[PDB]
């Protein structure tokens, strides 16, 4: 409800330009609609869509003039998450690749002699080398801030 | 294995706050009966009182909390600590943190500390499996039953995600 941008439910545009945009693919009477492939340009799909119409709805995004999702989190109201509730994971999903990324490498001086010892990967991964990826920060993310860094290692 | 006697207490602390944590909503736990996602508070009460919201039960009872917890912290740090239950030892006889302050930089070892029975420890973690049952339902299926000879292992119904909420 903030800055504009209305929650979709007053429908004005979006919902209609929608029930327009998608719905002249629908005028695909211009073929023969029964069973097809070769055609189904009409009947289905709209299932994902129109039979997801008033569905999408539904949490607002306060989709806005034009009548489309102006997608915003910034840390106000329910939204504090339309990208943050799915905004952290990414952080999470990446830099523990860094762990594998690190400990894969930080092995590539152990057992001794290295590099292409980088090309032949010694199938490097599946558990703790990754499956620590699971559990890094605020329990041990300060794998950073002691003996591994510094750095302090040799 | 994994690592060194780093946190014990941290997770111990956790397991301390744990059982009586899962004792907390363990009132909704229903002696026999009185539950749901909660609002109230032990019994009674009726002074003047413990209140809302230009008051909150929060900041009053939980500012002062701070010095009650920092004492431990700095107590850990500069040991510091009883004689000695929690950091660490006197009686009798838990799972040993075992080590002393340093390594070869770190590893002159690191973990020969297993051994025994069922024992003391255990229940500390029990309540976090409790939790990962007890949290998961309560917004997914917000009441806790158990029911034999009736329709356990039969069911009845269904209930998924998108309904709505």
């Amino acid at each position: 409800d903030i800055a504009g941008l209305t929650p979709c439910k007053e429908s004005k545009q979006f919902a209609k330009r929608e029930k327009q945009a998608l719905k002249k693919l629908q005028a695909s009477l211009k073929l023969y609609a029964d069973d097809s492939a070769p055609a189904l340009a009409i009947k289905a799909t709209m299932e994902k869509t129109k039979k997801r119409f008033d569905n999408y709805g539904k949490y607002g995004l306060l989709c806005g003039s034009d009548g489309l999702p102006h997608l915003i989190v910034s840390g106000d109201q329910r939204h504090w998450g339309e990208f943050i509730t799915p905004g952290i994971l990414f952080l999470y999903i990446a830099g523990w690749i860094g762990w594998v990324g690190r400990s894969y490498l930080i092995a590539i001086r152990d057992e001794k002699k290295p590099t292409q010892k980088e090309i032949i990967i010694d199938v490097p991964l599946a558990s703790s080398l990754l499956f620590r990826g699971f559990s890094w920060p605020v329990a041990a993310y300060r794998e950073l801030l002691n003996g591994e860094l510094v750095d302090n290692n040799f | 294995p994994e690592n060194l006697r780093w946190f014990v207490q941290a997770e111990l602390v956790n397991g301390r706050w744990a059982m009586l944590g899962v004792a907390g909503m363990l009132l909704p736990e229903v002696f026999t009966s009185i539950g749901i996602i909660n609002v109230p508070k032990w019994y009674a009460a009726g002074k003047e009182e413990y209140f809302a919201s230009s008051s909150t039960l929060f900041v009053i009872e939980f500012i002062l909390s701070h010095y009650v917890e920092i004492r431990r912290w700095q107590d850990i740090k500069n040991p510091g600590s009883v004689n000695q239950d929690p950091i660490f030892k006197q009686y009798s006889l838990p799972a040993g943190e075992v080590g002393y302050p340093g390594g070869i930089f770190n590893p002159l070892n690191f973990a020969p500390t297993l051994e025994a029975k069922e024992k003391e420890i255990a229940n500390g973690r029990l309540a976090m499996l409790a939790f990962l049952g007890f949290i998961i339902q309560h917004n997914v299926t917000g009441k806790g039953p158990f029911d034999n000879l009736l329709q356990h292992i039969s069911d009845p119904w269904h209930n998924t995600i998108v309904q709505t909420l």
């Binding site: 995004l61 997608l71 339309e82 090309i119 010694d122 199938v123 703790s128 | 995600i161």
Partner: protein, 42 residues
């Protein structure tokens, strides 16, 4: 089999191979929850 181990690698198409036979899954998920638009927590 072992042991972490190591284990044994292979040559030039592993970082690659990763794209396909596993990474695809994505499009399954992206099918499974058709599109995303934004956050579905459970």
């Amino acid at each position: 089999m072992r042991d972490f181990k190591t284990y044994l690698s292979v040559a030039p198409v592993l970082s690659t191979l990763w794209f396909g036979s596993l990474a695809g899954l994505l499009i399954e998920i992206n099918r499974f929850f058709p599109d995303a638009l934004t956050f579905p927590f459970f």
